[PDB]
Design a binder for this molecule. Structure first.
Ligand code: NA
Length: 483
């Protein structure tokens, strides 16, 4: 009656307002106001309803009645304020828009709270779905000093024990929502990916996978598949995107050349070599799994003939390599195997495919070690930060962060469309954001390659396995154990 799940390292300290735990573990007993559902659909959790007013500066919340914390204390407006007051407006959470713009917090009754903000809050509800710091810890569980002691949330699982070999949880009785069909969940610390594979084959664990839980590469997936195991691939929510730098590479200023580069590539071959066929070719910057991902298009199918024709219309002629005004069509793809595993390999598939359309792709393979590149690779941020996290961070000129880099920067043309989308409310977010995506697509400003898949495996006895919506969730839901 016990589900066992690998984790790649100890759970850590579970303080729901700090940064030391494995998120998926916190997700076991901590609950948010609203949940990030499939497709980025916002669902009722500790709040049953909500209303956003004042152009996004006011949030009204109706709290769920009949909720108890695992220590038996009551969930209500007072307990909600006390938590929210623990993290919102604290300088340490300024990276989140709702903390940063937080103005004030009025309790109205035992089940109604209103929050006020100095400015509209981009993706407000989404942010409130996060694993941390947005979740609810019993006010009586913490001492005079206010320091986190025990992990007393409202969620379905109670921590029975934790150390550096496993952590052990039991179903919480008088949990408000649906209870697990099984009695217990153990999280076993197995750091080496070779061991994790073995442990599933033996019947030592039931579950393996998750970027931030117990990763399982493509190769491991095929292996397990070969061993007759259930291998479950989520097409994912992070996009590998190739970027163009026309400021450096005079040929990429011609959008016909960009397009040719993009349809001259075989995403399917990218998926084969790097992800063993498991990755879905990308037509859109964001997969359909994300909210506001746009009108969805088919991933382009490699078309060398169409690519060659574009290049010729643009005045690049020659064989085997095209030139123009005596200059060969040479582009430098900069890669770091450190920062994107498989990065070099991708480059050699592409270089070979570019060769076929007449482009001479030079690869510069680097350390984790700045616009000195013609082409390069970016990865989107993924759920639950997207699409606005990536759009803003990677595409808005005016947003400038040391750690980032830019996919595409057009102040006169794109910024306005991004700004309008970030300003949009309710019904108007979708068509406003659709204009960002039309711009990018009509101008061939970026080249999405594949969606990065997320791979889980379970044992034969696990039924009801449901791929997690984000990498910060533990997929314990729905499971029934046959034995
Ligand atoms: Na969850």
């Amino acid at each position: 009656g016990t589900l066992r799940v690998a984790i790649a390292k100890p759970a850590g300290n579970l303080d729901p307002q700090s940064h030391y735990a494995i998120w998926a573990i916190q997700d076991l007993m901590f609950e948010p106001l609203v949940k990030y559902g499939k497709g980025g659909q916002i669902e009722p959790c500790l709040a049953t309803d909500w209303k956003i007013e004042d152009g996004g500066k006011t949030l009204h919340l109706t709290l769920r009645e009949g909720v108890k914390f695992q220590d038996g204390t009551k969930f209500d407006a007072a307990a909600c304020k006390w938590n929210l007051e623990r993290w919102m407006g604290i300088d340490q959470f300024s990276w989140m828009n709702c903390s940063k713009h937080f103005q004030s917090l009025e309790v109205v009754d035992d089940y109604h709270i209103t929050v006020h903000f100095k400015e509209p809050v981009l993706a407000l509800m989404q942010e409130l779905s996060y694993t941390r710091p947005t979740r609810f810890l019993s006010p009586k569980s913490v001492d005079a000093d206010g320091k986190f002691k025990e992990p007393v949330g409202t969620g379905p699982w109670v921590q029975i024990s934790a150390d550096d070999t496993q952590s052990v949880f039991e179903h919480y009785d008088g949990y408000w929502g649906d209870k697990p069909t099984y009695e217990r969940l153990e999280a076993k610390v197995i750091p080496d990916a070779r061991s994790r594979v073995a442990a599933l084959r033996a019947g030592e664990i039931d579950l393996v996978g998750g970027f931030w839980i117990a990763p399982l590469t493509p190769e491991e997936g095929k292996q397990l598949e070969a061993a007759g195991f259930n291998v479950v691939v989520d097409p994912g929510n992070v996009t590998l995107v190739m970027a163009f730098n026309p400021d450096r590479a005079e040929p990429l200023k011609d959008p016909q050349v960009r397009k040719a580069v993009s349809i001259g590539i075989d995403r399917a071959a990218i998926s084969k070599v790097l992800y063993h066929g498991y990755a879905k070719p990308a037509g859109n910057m964001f997969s359909a799994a994300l909210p506001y991902a746009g009108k969805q298009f088919d991933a382009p199918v490699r078309d060398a003939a169409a690519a060659s024709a574009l290049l010729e219309k643009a005045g690049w002629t020659g064989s085997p390599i095209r030139s123009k005004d005596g200059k060969p069509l040479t582009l430098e793809l900069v890669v770091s195997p450190d920062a994107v595993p498989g990065s070099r390999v991708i480059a050699e598939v592409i270089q070979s495919e570019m060769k076929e359309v007449g482009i001479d792709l030079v690869i510069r393979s680097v350390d984790h070690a700045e616009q000195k590149y013609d082409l390069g690779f970016f990865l989107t941020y993924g759920a639950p930060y997207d699409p606005f996290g990536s759009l803003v961070a990677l595409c808005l000129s005016t947003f400038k962060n040391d750690v980032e880099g830019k996919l595409v920067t057009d102040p006169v043309n794109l910024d306005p469309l991004i700004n309008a989308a970030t300003a949009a409310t309710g019904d108007q977010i979708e068509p406003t954001i659709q204009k960002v995506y039309d711009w990018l697509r009509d101008n061939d400003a970026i080249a999405p390659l594949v969606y990065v898949p997320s791979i889980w495996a379970h044992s034969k006895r696990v039924q009801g396995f449901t791929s997690p919506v984000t990498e910060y969730d533990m997929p314990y839901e729905n499971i029934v154990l046959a034995e």
